[PDB]
Design an enzyme around this catalytic site. Structure first.
Site: not given
Ligand SMILES: [Xe]
Ligand SMILES: [Xe]
Ligand SMILES: [Xe]
Length: 263
Positions: A45, A48, A105, A141, A209, A212
């Protein structure tokens, strides 16, 4: 500081996995500490932030507007979409999507934003054009979190990510307004509680930010400093460990504590 590097080495031993680490002075851009700076780790993440950087670059060029409203369907909703799942009827603005992607997230928010810029390949093209020829996004994602050993897809190096983040937050790329917006979103991060924030003394600034993914992947990017102002960029990644999330969190927090202790 050497003692921080020792904590990183200790984390490697205790996690049974590689850890990459960079400390970068925000103003001067000098590298203050590094460990496996040229090795690849899955971004998870943490991408992002780069994603919303590309979005903000298009807003600057008038190719995007923060108030533009995007509608979508239940079919667009992938795993972990705590904000986007609530707006199937009214849709969300581009600004709301970035806020969701960075502060929470939100995975669907990230995918929708990717669609606005033309997908992972165009995020990578964006990064390439700002002088990061190392970092690469290849997937959406949630597949980008797969973290297959030796797989280079969806990876960065600690050095590449640190310098790119610096270029986004303080470099010539974005307008002043967009740099402030990107950092404001990161300051409002709500899903990195047990990491660096857990070592942060009262009154310190942090914009971050976390990420995982599969195979013990964990990581964080951050701009932080005392007296309510950032002065340093910190990037830490690990992958390969069989450790629980809690132990990975605690290892990053421990590295965080050493950074602060020897600031
Ligand atoms: Xe910053
Ligand atoms: Xe770590
Ligand atoms: Xe950290």
């Amino acid at each position: 500081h050497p003692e921080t590097l020792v904590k990183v080495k200790d984390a490697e031993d205790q996690l049974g996995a590689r850890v990459g680490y960079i400390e970068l002075d925000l103003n001067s851009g000098k590298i203050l500490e590094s460990f496996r700076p040229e090795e690849r780790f899955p971004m998870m993440s943490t991408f992002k932030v780069l994603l919303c950087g590309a979005v903000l670059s298009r807003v600057d060029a008038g190719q995007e507007q923060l108030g533009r409203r995007i509608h979508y369907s239940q079919n667009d909703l992938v795993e972990y979409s705590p904000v986007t799942e609530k707006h199937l009827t009214d849709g969300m603005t581009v600004r709301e999507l970035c806020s969701a992607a960075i502060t929470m997230s939100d995975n669907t928010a990230a995918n929708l934003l990717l669609t606005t810029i033309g997908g992972p390949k165009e995020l990578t093209a964006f990064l390439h054009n700002m002088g990061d020829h190392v970092t690469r996004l290849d997937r959406w994602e949630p597949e980008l979190n797969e973290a297959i050993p030796n797989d280079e897809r969806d990876t960065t190096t600690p050095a590449a990510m640190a310098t790119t983040l610096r270029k986004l937050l303080t470099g010539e790329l974005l307008t002043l307004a967009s740099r402030q917006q990107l950092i404001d979103w990161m300051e409002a991060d709500k899903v990195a509680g047990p990491l660096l924030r857990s070592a942060l003394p009262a009154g310190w600034f942090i914009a971050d930010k976390s990420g995982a993914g599969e195979r013990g992947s964990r990581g964080i990017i951050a701009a932080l400093g005392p007296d309510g102002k950032p002065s340093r960029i910190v990037v830490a990644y690990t992958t390969g460990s069989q450790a629980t999330m809690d132990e990975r969190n605690r290892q990053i927090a421990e590295i965080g504590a050493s950074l602060i202790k020897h600031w």
